[PDB]
Design a protein around this nucleic acid. Structure first.
Lengths: 402, 1140
DNA sequence: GTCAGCATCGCATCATACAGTCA
DNA sequence: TGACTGTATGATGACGATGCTGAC
């Protein structure tokens, strides 16, 4: 009903539609009436142009969010021609972590489960820089850049060392230090604004540091593994850890510590993989371990706006699937692990990359190509938002248009 | 690196906010208008509007309401800005001093949260005990309004209805009650809550939930004798209280959505409505009483008043006068009759206020003033679509121009008081004089008894006690009236010549040789008093008595040759008082001492046209604040006389000037005339408040234009203009334009109103072309209202529409260039277009069509179709460079008159903005930021030199120089990119670095290089390099110019001190206000100097300048300047002001 | 032979069970 | 002697590459 009458307008000009499905379609209506079949030529002619909404913006009449929403349908359209895969570059011992280069649009970094990292940049045909690990307990978990000089990167390995190391191989000191063996970490995130680092491990306790020393943190953030942590870009000051518990718990770090003390903490069914703070810093993309994807708001962190069911299971030897926001847009990207048991629209439900609107929850696009049936559990758009890099098993996939 | 300078030239004319009440006093009614960053205030008068204070802010005014707390003497103004700075302001006047005082301020917000689409809305409630704010979806901010908190602490509370259209506080309720309209899957509904600050939360409202309409957009809280709220949607307006409800659906509404309301009578009997199509609506509520008296309602009435400008804001005043605030056109004072006119319509326009925005395109063109012109043309958009011509200085026109060689001086007079004015003009040739009587426009000579022909005078004109004075070069003469004779006539002992003069109504001096001799006037005779010697030859003279007439002067102004000094003298005791020696060997010419608004001034204006100015005190006659400025080269003469409600002082030269005062500082506004010599004030009864020019070749005479700093001419189109350019060889403009059309049901469209285009003298119409739309086009008539795009040829002088070309059905005109190409001598009009269909969101087909203009027919040549929308195009080395969707294609113009595609650049998402310098190309992309291409004279292809890696949604783009690139962004921010000058690797030289950032507070639509300022003529070198102008959506015009590293660092520390004393208004820190701020990030400025802050130094008091300079030694360098900078920096800030 | 169809191997969670402390 | 929390062990679901056969 209202979501199909709340889409192609988008809004200004307010004129056209307004009839509210013809002042109510006598409840649907019952039996035949449209339905979503002829929700087709309506959406086909949606907004009228852009070149006339742009002009409406150029006159200051149309509000910016109106535009940006009709500008992201200019996106999606090109994303429907992303369907081709410029490059792919592999290596043994499977892909686990993924990070883009903050500044550069052509370089990306990938981690292994064996301890081996690759700095891959393109438009160069020069060969990627590499680091060789231990190939056993060398699993990398959460790999991020160094916000100062890009030629350095932070990392969190199963070997037990959250380090700062150059791509030229040489370790530039170490942040965290286990001293035992039976423990290692699963998460890591930093920040340029508030100057911190963070790491969550598999026992539920987490550490936080400055980019210089500082071990003001170790307190248990819960029972069992911390699968993911993420700092708020616009808040800085704010933090959120998602993990196996069936709870995301948030925090603001700072004030409040004394154990069982944390602003919010929202529960779930099943384990969770991702927190993922938004570019704006307000929404959180929690992404569960069975189906269901949730989104809370900054208004009531307790209550979620709505759940998006979506088949992405857990598996011992399948890299955990984390969904992620798009920069620039309110889009959501996630790989698909099709599943024999649910409510599904479209047989035969292949494996693919899914994209929804964060304000709706509806699927706007899907990305798939044969010659590559692998499950992509990592995708995470580049900071310009013009390309997508999926980590898929032994492979690394570069989504562009060209 | 990059050091830049931004200054506001023409302030925004577009009216954002409007509100009425009693802000300055109780006895007076106030009009408050908001123009983006400007708050302007007015007092309503008898058939007029009186302006009293103009204060700017460090913000975009989002909320503006008048409200008076209980017990409070007065009326406070709550202002909320776009960056969420909140302030409560109060008006205070202490004699001459008027300042706006802030009772309470604070930047409330949520540290994180997404700003809702419809914008923020603020409501202050009738009882004035809280301020409600809707900043973010799902939360309701409420500000406890007691003076405490002076910091405006607020608390948010959960709003579970996530989607609110409009909200209002209610009147006459037992408790604070909110009334909003929200939307859920079941449609939109009206709902009430009680806002209790106890518990800091809501409580159950007096109402159950309803099911209003399906498109209700505006809520109005109706006061008593009632309560409850009327809800106006489109198609239907309804009333809602507790038990009762009222609903009407007049069919005169569905045509246009009504967008604004305003209470006429405070009781809430009747309201004014306005729509997007400028139609004005009355809304009447008729009340009811049972028995002796009760209260109720009996339907509504709408009666339909008439048509005004497009109301963004509406407000009623008194006596049927409504002020209409328009963003898309001029704001109006309008008068409401009880009797329709010929057209119907109770609406009649009182006054119109010029509104420049939205400026969708502007172009600097050098018409008229041949050498430089100065003019800036721009656009208005919609029914208020127009061209505005903007130029610096003031102009006059010559009604009668009789040729006349070799004059010197000229004078007015009228013998007869019974008419009461001045006639019979006189002018003097070399050695002789000539008298010319006034009647109509004819002058000639004729003959007047007693007027002396054989001799030339320096004085004439009527003089008190019914008489004329005429003092010649051989003697001094006096004239009688009724008999017209020569009672009294005076000579000097040795029959010498008269050299240096002066004179005045009640007294005169005549000098001769040296000294001053000093004369004095008695009834019909002389009787001189005392004598003079002084020091050698004296350079001219002025007696002018400072005051009403007066006409007796206690004062005498004079000059010298050797010492070169304008002295002032006591009378009749003379005696030197103030020395002041001046450097140079030039000599002082044309002195004077003026009076304007209590102020006490004088002027002295030497051989260079250079001129000095003082601020004075008459009591001691002592001069101070020593400063001079220089203009041109040619001699200046100095008269001085009146006109309406100002005063004037003006010098005469190659660049004829004028000096006044504005808000108690001076102003120098030039005139547009070529050459002036002698000229004289002539206020005739067939020429009310006019003036006569004498020139070297002819006379002049005319009426003089409106009194401003910037002159603006307006030619309404009555339809939206989009792009403009100049065709010098055709002496006319090309204007892409469009009108809305609507279906005629009988094929065709039958139009809507007579406007531009449809009134062209010749016109032409597009001709298909293929598409291909053939084989059953199969669209519809659905999606009514149609836009017809046009090209208009407009004369540069008469501004009459010469030619109108209509484009294809469903075509959008996007770009336009005037240029010639190849070895082809013809200058063309090239327009790039786009086809825009219902069925398609992205255009896939457009056209690059070439026109050539000859004798009003406008023939077509090229006509070339492309696959995509041509967004931008620009002349490029005899070639045409164009942007088609995601492609940057360079066309070549060949001898068979066809367009040929040389090379391509395919790597873009969508390229909208193209700018070029030399072989370099600056590409602006709505998505993937900025891109710098160059060109290859013998490869043809497109290398990609560098790119900015940081994503920016751009509105306009420009090239400052070879290595710096200016951009405007969607959040009202400015940024600059640079190619890395350091060779080193390839990596760094492929990365443009963002070195400049600055929050403009405005949305820039177009950049253009140029200036409205003359050259020099001292003291070239110039202090700043380059000059980039820009047009904005709110009608503001700004300037960007390059700076040296001395200055940027100079003015940067200078800003910081100024940022200590201002005084702020609202207490907003200038750094915060200028910090780069978008939805994702907040970062300081850097790379950008706010010129507005720097020139706003000239207005503080003298102990304040002294408060900064005395330590501005804390930094100032050595060489020949320290604290002497204290009058350097005024001479540096003078040096700023003149770049625009 | 390139391609179809089975073994085989590469520390994730939910569920059992004993110690280890901590206090 | 309750609690909380940390130790070598097991069922298990079902992706990847790697690899070996037999049977076309």
């Amino acid at each position: 009903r209202n979501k199909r009458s709340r889409s192609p307008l988008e809004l200004e000009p307010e004129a056209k539609k307004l009839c509210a499905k013809g002042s109510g379609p006598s409840r649907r209506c019952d039996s035949d009436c449209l339905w979503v079949g002829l929700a087709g030529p309506q959406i086909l002619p949606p907004c009228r142009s852009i070149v006339r909404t742009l002009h409406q913006h150029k006159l200051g009449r149309a509000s910016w969010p109106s535009v940006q929403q009709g500008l992201q349908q200019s996106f999606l359209h090109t994303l429907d021609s992303y369907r081709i895969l410029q490059k792919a570059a592999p290596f043994d011992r499977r892909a686990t972590s993924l990070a883009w280069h903050p500044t550069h649009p052509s370089t990306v970094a990938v981690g292994s489960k064996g301890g081996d990292i690759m700095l891959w940049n393109f438009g160069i045909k020069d060969k990627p820089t590499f680091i060789k690990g231990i190939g056993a307990g060398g699993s990398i978990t959460g790999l991020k850049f160094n916000p100062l000089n890009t030629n350095q990167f932070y990392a969190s390995s199963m070997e037990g060392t959250t380090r700062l190391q150059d791509f030229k191989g040489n370790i530039l000191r170490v942040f965290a230090s286990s001293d035992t063996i039976n423990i290692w970490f699963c998460s890591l995130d930093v920040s340029a604004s508030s100057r911190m680092v963070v790491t969550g491990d598999n026992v539920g306790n987490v550490i936080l540091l400055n980019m210089d020393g500082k071990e003001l943190w170790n307190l248990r953030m819960h029972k069992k593994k911390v699968t993911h942590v993420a700092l708020n870009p616009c808040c800085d000051w704010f933090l959120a850890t998602a993990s196996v518990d069936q709870t995301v718990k948030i925090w603001d770090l700072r004030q409040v510590r004394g154990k069982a003390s944390f602003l919010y903490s929202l529960p779930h069914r099943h384990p969770v993989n991702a927190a993922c703070f938004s570019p704006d810093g307000a929404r959180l993309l929690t992404t569960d371990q069975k189906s269901e994807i949730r989104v809370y708001s900054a208004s009531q962190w307790d209550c979620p706006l709505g759940l998006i069911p979506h088949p992405h299971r857990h598996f011992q030897h399948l890299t955990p699937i984390k969904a992620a926001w798009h920069p620039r847009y309110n889009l959501i990207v996630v790989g698909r692990y099709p599943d024999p048991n649910f409510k599904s629209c479209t047989p035969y439900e292949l494996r693919t990359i899914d994209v929804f609107d964060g304000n709706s929850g509806k699927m706007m696009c899907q990305l798939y190509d044969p010659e590559s049936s692998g499950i992509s559990s990592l995708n995470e758009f580049n900071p310009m938002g013009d390309t997508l890099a999926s980590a898929m098993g032994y492979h690394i996939l570069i989504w562009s248009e060209q | 690196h990059s050091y830049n300078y931004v200054v506001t030239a023409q302030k925004p004319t577009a009216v954002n906010g409007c509100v009425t009440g009693h802000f300055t006093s109780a006895e007076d009614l106030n009009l408050l208008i908001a123009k983006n960053t400007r708050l302007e205030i007015y007092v309503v008068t008898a058939e007029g509007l009186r302006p009293v204070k103009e204060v700017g802010m460090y913000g975009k005014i989002a909320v503006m309401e008048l409200f008076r707390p209980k017990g409070e003497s007065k009326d406070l103004l709550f202002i909320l800005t776009a960056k969420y700075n909140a302030c409560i302001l109060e008006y205070k006047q202490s004699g001459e001093s008027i300042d706006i005082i802030t009772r309470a301020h604070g930047n409330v917000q949520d540290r994180i949260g997404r700003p809702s689409e419809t914008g923020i809305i603020g409501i202050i409630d009738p009882e004035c005990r809280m301020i409600g704010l809707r900043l973010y979806d799902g939360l309701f901010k409420v500000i406890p309004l007691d003076r405490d908190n002076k910091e405006l602490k607020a608390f948010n509370i959960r709003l579970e209805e996530l989607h609110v259209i409009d909200v209002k506080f209610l009147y006459g309720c037992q408790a604070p009650t909110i009334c909003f309209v929200y939307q859920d899957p079941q449609g939109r509904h009206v709902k009430t809550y009680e806002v209790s600050l106890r518990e800091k939360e809501f409580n159950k409202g007096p109402w159950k939930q309803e099911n209003v309409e399906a498109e209700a957009s505006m809520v109005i809280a109706v006061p008593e004798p009632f309560g409850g709220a009327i809800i106006i949607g489109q198609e239907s307006i309804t009333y809602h209280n507790g038990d009762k409800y009222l609903a009407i659906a007049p069919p005169i509404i569905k045509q246009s959505t009504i967008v604004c309301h305003n209470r006429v009578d405070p009781n809430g009997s009747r309201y004014l409505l306005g729509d997007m199509e400028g139609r004005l609506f009355m809304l009447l509520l008729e009340k009811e009483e049972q028995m002796d008296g009760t209260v109720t309602l009996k339907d509504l009435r709408v009666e339909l008043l008439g048509e005004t400008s497009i109301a963004e804001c509406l407000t009623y005043l008194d006596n049927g006068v409504v002020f209409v605030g328009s963003r898309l056109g001029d704001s109006q004072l309008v008068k409401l009759n009880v009797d329709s006119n010929e057209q119907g319509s109770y609406v009649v326009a009182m006054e119109t206020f010029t509104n420049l925005g939205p400026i969708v395109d502007m172009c600097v063109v050098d018409l008229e003033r041949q050498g430089q012109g100065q003019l800036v043309t721009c656009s208005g958009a919609f029914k208020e679509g127009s061209l505005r011509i903007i130029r610096n200085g003031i102009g006059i026109h010559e009604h009668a121009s009789i040729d006349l060689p070799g004059i010197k001086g000229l004078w007015p007079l009228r013998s007869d008081p019974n008419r009461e004015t001045d006639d019979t003009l006189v002018l003097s040739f070399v050695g002789q004089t000539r008298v010319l009587m006034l009647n109509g426009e004819e002058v000639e000579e004729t003959e007047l008894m007693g007027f002396v022909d054989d001799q030339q005078t320096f004085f004439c004109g009527n003089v008190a006690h019914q008489q004329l004075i005429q003092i010649t070069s051989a003697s001094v003469r006096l004239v009688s009236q009724e008999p017209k004779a020569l009672v009294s006539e005076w000579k000097e002992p040795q029959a010498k010549n008269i050299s240096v003069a002066s004179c005045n109504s009640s007294q005169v001096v005549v000098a001769v040789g040296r000294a001053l001799y000093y004369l004095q006037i008695h009834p019909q005779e002389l009787r001189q008093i005392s004598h003079t010697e002084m020091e050698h030859e004296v350079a001219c003279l002025d007696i002018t008595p400072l005051g009403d007439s007066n006409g007796l002067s206690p004062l005498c102004a004079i000059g010298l040759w050797t010492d070169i000094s304008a002295r002032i003298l006591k009378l009749p005791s003379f005696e030197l008082l103030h020395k002041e020696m001046l450097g140079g060997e030039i000599i002082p010419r044309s002195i004077l001492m003026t009076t304007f608004e209590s102020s006490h001034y004088l002027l002295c204006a030497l051989g260079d046209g250079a001129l000095f100015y003082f601020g004075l005190n008459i009591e001691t006659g002592l001069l101070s604040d020593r400063k001079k400025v220089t203009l041109g080269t040619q001699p200046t003469v100095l008269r001085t006389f009146r006109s309406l409600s100002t005063t004037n002082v003006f010098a005469c030269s190659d660049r004829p000037t004028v000096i006044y005062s504005s808000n108690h500082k001076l102003v120098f506004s030039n005139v547009n005339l070529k050459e002036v010599n002698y000229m004289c004030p002539l206020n005739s009864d067939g020429y009310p408040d006019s003036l006569a020019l004498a020139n070297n070749s002819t006379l002049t005479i005319g009426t003089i234009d409106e009194i401003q700093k910037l002159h603006i001419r307006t030619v309404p189109l009555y339809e939206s203009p989009r792009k403009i350019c100049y065709q010098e060889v055709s002496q006319c403009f090309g204007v892409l334009s469009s009108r809305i059309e609507v279906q005629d049901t009988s094929g065709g469209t039958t139009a809507l109103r007579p406007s531009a285009s449809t009134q062209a003298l010749s016109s032409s119409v597009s001709s298909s072309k293929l598409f291909s739309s053939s084989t059953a086009p199969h669209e519809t008539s659905f999606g009514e209202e149609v836009e017809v795009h046009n090209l208009l040829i407009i004369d540069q002088h008469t501004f009459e529409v010469l030619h109108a070309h209509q484009f294809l059905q469903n075509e959008y005109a996007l770009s336009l260039v005037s240029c010639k190409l190849g070895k082809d001598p013809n200058t063309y009009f090239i327009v790039g277009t786009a086809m825009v269909y219902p069925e398609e969101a992205e255009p896939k087909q457009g056209r690059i069509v070439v026109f050539q203009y000859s004798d009003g027919k406008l023939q077509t040549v090229a006509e070339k179709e492309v696959k995509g929308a041509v967004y931008s195009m620009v002349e490029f080395n005899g070639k045409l460079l164009a942007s088609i969707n995601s492609t940057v294609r360079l066309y070549e113009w060949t001898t068979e008159k066809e367009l040929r595609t040389e090379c391509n650049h395919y790597n873009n998402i969508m390229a909208l903005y193209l700018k070029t310098k030399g072989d370099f190309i600056l590409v602006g992309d709505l998505m993937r930021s900025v891109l710098l291409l160059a060109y290859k004279p013998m490869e043809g292809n497109f290398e990609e030199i560098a790119r900015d890696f940081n994503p920016n949604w751009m509105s306009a783009v420009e090239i400052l120089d070879d290595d710096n690139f200016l951009g405007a962004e969607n959040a009202f921010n400015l940024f600059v990119c640079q190619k890395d000058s350091a060779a080193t690797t390839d990596e760094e030289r492929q990365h443009l670095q963002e070195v400049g950032l600055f929050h403009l507070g405005e949305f820039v639509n177009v950049f253009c290089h140029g200036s409205l300022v003359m050259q020099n003529l001292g003291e070239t070198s110039t202090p700043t390099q380059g000059s980039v102008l820009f047009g904005t959506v709110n009608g503001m015009i700004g300037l960007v110019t390059s700076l040296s590293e001395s200055w940027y660092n100079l003015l940067l520390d200078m800003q910081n001190r100024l940022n200590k004393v201002i005084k702020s208004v609202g207490k907003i820190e200038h750094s915060f206000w200028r910090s780069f701020h978008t939805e994702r990030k907040t970062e300081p400025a850097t790379g950008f100097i706010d010129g507005d802050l720097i020139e706003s130094f000239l207005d503080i008091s003298r102990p304040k300048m002294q408060e900064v300079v005395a330590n501005l030694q804390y930094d100032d360098g050595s060489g020949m300047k320290r604290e002497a900078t204290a009058d350097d920096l005024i001479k540096v800030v003078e040096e700023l002001t003149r770049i625009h």
